[PDB]
Design a protein around this ligand. Structure first.
Ligand SMILES: Cc1c(-c2ccccc2)cccc1-c1cc(/C=C/C(=O)O)ccc1O
Ligand SMILES: Cc1c(-c2ccccc2)cccc1-c1cc(/C=C/C(=O)O)ccc1O
Lengths: 212, 8, 212, 8
């Protein structure tokens, strides 16, 4: 069983200068909260500890991007980082990440705001991303795949019951994952651009994710 | 390492 | 309306040495067939000619990857290119694209074979990718978004009727798109590696897609 | 250009 009630509790349980430095600080800060969020996802802690590491190292980036995007539904053409800094189109452009910034807004933030994606639907999507059967090295990808199927099974039932007149809402939610996949890959590149150049301090936790 | 210790 | 019968007809209507050179030759060859496939997709030709160019330039890569992956369901741990060449794990590895080759098999080809994705479900997924509302420059992304919603609306009804005992099959199909997104991005990189080095001939049509 | 002509 995969009750959406607890996935929502996981989302509820983990909520609260230079733009580049703030980005790195926020990512490192929210990596800790991500672990506490994952622990609260049903059946995640039951998996082998090595698979938990693989799933978190494989989805931490998309998981955090989905978090601040939904968190930025209220900001007017901008992004709200975990450090409390609001990065708008001007600061992002002057920071050299104007292109990927626009993508985050047009493909994620704005799309989330238009359909009024609630925190239950957000958690289910993040739970789906967490239960990634494509992660390399998983001792039992089938079990991870089974948990994923349980997740979007509870989500679809939630959407049909919560929004009975939006039959395509369930499909619309899942169809934001491809954008999250490509956006995450691009954001990860900039993180290496930031780290590689040494221009921006990289803290321990984020540093560990950026390494082998 | 830190990820391993935080999960435990 | 978005009848799955014609989408299947579109799939049915467009079916038929050095690995690197064969890859480039196949991609260029299938770019022409892709245009004929798109023309046969319902309502695509009705869109403005400029939006058709944007959608094809934005999804041609994923569209072709989805084609040869499903075409390679019968090949044993290998990929069948449009030129008739079978690229296996050894030839791909010796070609420097062993990593992305494994991804194609574990994330797409093998996943397609296990669930027995039929050509109707393949066409709908490719039609969904074609109707990408996230494509930049679209004069009316809402119309493209409406066509996409019509597509997966017909697909879900097809899955519920064709596979009534696989309630999660519709979601399972859409959840292969994130992999197709990342795999396409990586394949596109290798294409630039191939073109940039000049080591591999790049034909006209493929050359046009690799440029502005 | 070729993409434009093929669609027409
Ligand atoms: C969001 C972002 C950017 C960025 C910021 C503005 C505009 C365009 C891109 C760049 C690098 C990393 C990140 C990034 C930040 C976070 C932090 C999120 C948070 O504050 O909770 C997580 C993952 C990331 O890839
Ligand atoms: C498939 C592929 C590779 C590749 C081939 C073997 C193993 C790993 C990667 C590399 C570059 C381009 C492509 C590529 C080929 C095609 C051609 C497909 C066809 O023959 O129909 C289309 C898009 C592509 O990105």
């Amino acid at each position: 069983d995969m009750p959406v009630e607890r996935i929502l509790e996981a989302e509820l349980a983990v909520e609260p200068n230079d733009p580049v430095t703030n980005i790195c600080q926020a990512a490192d800060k929210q990596l800790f909260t991500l672990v506490e969020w994952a622990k609260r996802i049903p059946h995640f802690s039951e998996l082998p500890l090595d698979d938990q590491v693989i799933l978190l190292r494989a989805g931490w980036n998309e998981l955090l991007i989905a978090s601040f995007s939904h968190r930025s539904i209220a900001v007017k053409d901008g992004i709200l980082l975990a450090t409390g800094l609001h990065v708008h189109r001007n600061s992002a452009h002057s920071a050299g990440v104007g292109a990927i910034f626009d993508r985050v807004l047009t493909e994620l933030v704005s799309k989330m705001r238009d359909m009024q994606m609630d925190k239950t639907e957000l958690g289910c999507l993040r739970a789906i991303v967490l239960f990634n059967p494509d992660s390399k090295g998983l001792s039992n990808p089938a079990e991870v795949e089974a948990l994923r199927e349980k997740v979007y099974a509870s989500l679809e039932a939630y959407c049909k019951h919560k929004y009975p007149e939006q039959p395509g809402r369930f499909a619309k939610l899942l169809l934001r994952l491809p954008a999250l996949r490509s956006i995450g890959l691009k954001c990860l590149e900039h993180l290496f651009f930031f780290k590689l150049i040494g221009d921006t301090p990289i803290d321990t936790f984020l540093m560990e994710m950026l390494e082998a | 390492k830190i990820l391993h210790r935080l999960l435990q």
